[PDB]
């Protein structure tokens, strides 16, 4: 399966600026957006490996530098039950 | 009825984290995932006691080494009335 | 009337815990839960004051244990104006 | 036109006890209720001026035992406009 | 166009006040109220420029006495793309 | 592809300012608006890049003059990825 990578900020200027460096600094798929509320805003993207290390780190930056990152995490392998309660199918 | 465990996060990237490390580690049913404000969401798998200390004991260090743990419980044996009032059925 | 019976947590993961023991304390019904944003959910019980009051007792030992409490009260003889306007009814 | 009075506290449970000695206190209706977020959350009344302050005191003082208290409030004569945006009609 | 007159508060007894000193102290049609999470409330009204000021001043005094004034803002001749997109509209 | 401009702001009035200020510093549409909760709103703006950073420049000082700025942006180039998953187009 496509490896997952996730952004997280407090603030949606800075999720969309870091999906646009995400999508743009490696060959990622965003795939899905959730907000979960307290101003906490989530973006997903598939591809492989690599890919989503690259375009996380990217996209970790590019948040830093316009307002909160809350998290970043690369899943290389994740479970088929996660595409079933959250927004990381294609 | 089968056993319930639960963990508890602010911040949903530290959740899927949890929740992939909790079907990763035992046979349990990813049987919803519930946001209340506050950035705070939870994530609800059934399986027997074994399997459920399993899942929310690797869901919580998981969800520890990224982001914010709440809360991480099993109850063993959830009472019927709670399934009327809580998404923790199939 | 019925006496209500209500817990108030910050986290749904203590409430949830709360309600079960709520329901194994004493002979009271889980009637609604309810959430108000910034994290906060309350469980409503009915049941006869004494049968609440074990139970909302007990709840409020589960919930602190796992969770934030944020309050525990009973209502002997709930006006039946609050069954129009909150929850609390069957 | 009846006065109106107003209980916001964060927190439910306060609130619906605040209701409960409102309505027992005097002669009010309990006309609404709103939940705006942030765990804020408001209890509405209506009768005579007195009944209202009477009321509204005796919801305040039961709300300040059991939680927190944000607002107390009374409006005896509330503009006709109120109706349309506020849950205060009757 | 008409004027816009606003005022945001964090709870909303304080914005029924404030909405009420509104309407009360000059010819201004409240036209709607509007909650994004953390308590924040806001109410809306339009009326010619004069009556936006003398009613956002009423009301900001009014909220200030009872509770949390957030903002309180009159914008003259707002744009046309406004109404389009947030609540300000009759 | 038109550039997109965007403001986010801890409170509503501050984003209406900042929107009417953006709509009136440049040839730009004003094409969204976002709430995620904990009182954080932001508004979407379309044009060139010039355009975008000009309406952007003006909404930023006109926000905090009357509330609080949380993040302002320009993307000059923004993929097309965005606007699936973002309310950025029209």
Redesign the interface.
């Known amino acids: 399966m496509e490896a997952?990578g996730?952004?997280?900020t407090?603030?949606?200027?800075?999720l969309?600026?870091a999906?646009?460096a995400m999508?743009?600094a490696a060959r990622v798929?965003?795939v899905?957006?959730?907000?979960?509320?307290?101003?906490?805003?989530?973006?997903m993207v598939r591809g492989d490996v690599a890919a989503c290390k690259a375009a996380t780190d990217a996209g970790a930056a590019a948040a830093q530098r316009?307002?909160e990152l809350?998290?970043?995490?690369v899943?290389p392998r994740?479970?088929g039950?996660?595409e079933?309660?959250?927004p990381?199918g294609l």
């Open positions: 997952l996730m952004i997280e407090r603030g949606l200027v800075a969309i600026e999906s646009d999508v743009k798929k965003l899905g957006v959730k907000q979960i509320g307290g101003g906490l805003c989530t973006a316009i307002g809350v998290s970043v995490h899943i994740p479970h039950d996660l079933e309660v959250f990381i």
